Amino acid sequence: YLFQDEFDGPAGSAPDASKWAVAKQYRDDRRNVFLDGKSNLVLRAAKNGPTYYSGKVQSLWRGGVGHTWEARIKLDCLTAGAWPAYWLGNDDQGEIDVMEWYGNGNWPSATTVHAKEWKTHNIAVDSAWHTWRCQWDEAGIRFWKDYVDGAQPYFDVPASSLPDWPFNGPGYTVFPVFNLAVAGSGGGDPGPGSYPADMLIDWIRVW
Ligand SMILES: [Mg+2]
């Protein structure tokens, strides 16, 4: 693999500090961002009195065009207020939102490519383990859920379809992000929700 983390390690420990920056409400607290000892990174949103704390990690590694990206994710957080997301970010222009689920009761879970000009596709996601695959090459960006050899992508965004396509710029790269947001537009009010809520990631691989 060009980049991977299998999130192996003792229960309660931090994700690999050579690969991830833990967002510092997000906090760098092992109660909210921790390896579970069973090969998963856990991002946990928890209520501390009136206040919610949760977790987010950003990859220190950035990858460019021509690769396939896949993560295995379990959403134990499909509740009001919660907003789990797996995305490939860029500081400047563009974003690949591989998988988002919204706790606001209004927006369907979806995959979205942003050029600046965006394309979105609704996805179903429940609380079971699923894999989420993104191939991003010169010609476009396409996606699979629970890939098996020869499966067709559920969503294909040709580079040509978005005139302001940033992704073929020289040296353009993206960083993987996993986060479990609470409230905001996508999460809605967490009051009626069930906390603590967990987003689990078994692995991310890029090749
Ligand atoms: Mg693992």
> How far does the centroid of ligand 1 lie from the alpha carbon of residue 89, in Å?
22
CA–centroid distance, 129 to ligand 1, in Å, is: 12
- Backbone dihedral angles phi then psi of residue 120, each to the nearest 5 degrees: -130, 155
Cis peptide before 196 (omega within 30 of 0): yes
Whole-Å CA distances, 45 to 56, 163, 183? 10, 38, 11
**Given the structure tokens 């692995």, which residue do they identify?**
203
Give the angle subtended at the CA of 127 by the CAs of 200 and 188, to the nearest 5°. Answer: 85
- 117 assigned ligand-binding residue: no
- Is residue 207 helix, strand or coil? coil
Is 70 annotated in a binding site? The answer is no
Question: What are the tokens at 99?
Answer: 């998988």
80 CB-side CA count, 13 A: 7
Phi, psi dihedrals of residue 96, rounded to the nearest 5°:
-115, 105
Tokens linked to 95 = 């974003």
* Distance of alpha carbon 174 from alpha carbon 176, whole angstroms: 7
Planar angle of CA 39, 43, 44, nearest 5 degrees: 120
Tokens of 13: 């420990």
Q: How far apart are the first and last CA of the chain?
A: 5
Cα→Cα distances 175→29, 81, 204, Å? 22, 25, 12
Task: Residue 201: name the closest of 29, 105, 72, 14 by CA.
Answer: 72
- Cα-based distances in Å from 98 to 9, 85, 144, 145: 26, 8, 10, 10
d(CA 56, CA 40): 14
Instruction: Give dist(CA 61, CA 113) in Å, integer.
Output: 20
Domains of the chain, by residue range, sit at 1-207
Q: What single string gives the DSSP state of each residue in 15-84?
A: PPTTTEEEP--B---TTTEEE-SSS-EEEEEEEETTEEEB-EEEES--B-SSEEEEEEEEEE--STTEEE
Q: What is the whole-number distance in angstroms between the Cα of residue 192 and the centre of ligand 1?
A: 31
**How far away, in angstroms, is 38 Cα from ligand 1 center?**
7
Tokens 């983390």 correspond to what residue?
5
For ligand 1, the distance from its centroid to the CA atom of residue 41, given in whole angstroms, is 7
* b/e sequence 79-114, b meaning 16+ C-beta within 10 Å: bbbbbbbbbbbbeeebbbbbbbbbbbeebebbbbbb
Distance CA 43, CA 197 (A): 8
* CATH of 1-207 among 2.170.130.10, 3.60.130.10, 3.40.50.10860, 2.60.120.200: 2.60.120.200
Amino acid residing at 165: W
**Residue 176 phi, psi (nearest 5):** -60, 140
What distance in angstroms lies between residue 21's CA and the mean position of ligand 1's atoms? 18
**Closest residue by Cα to residue 27 from 61, 57, 59, 60:** 57
3-class secondary-structure state, position 143: strand
Contact 203, 5 (CB under 8 A): yes
Q: What is the dihedral of CA 171, 172, 176, 177, to 10 degrees?
A: 130
The answer to whether 164 is annotated as binding is no
Angstrom CA distances, 20 to 28, 41, 45, stand at 11, 11, 19
What residues pack around ion ligand 1 (CB closer than 5 A)? 6-7, 39, 202-203
Ligand 1 geometric centre to CA of 6 (Å) = 4
Give the distance (Å) from ligand 1 centre to CA of residue 169.
33
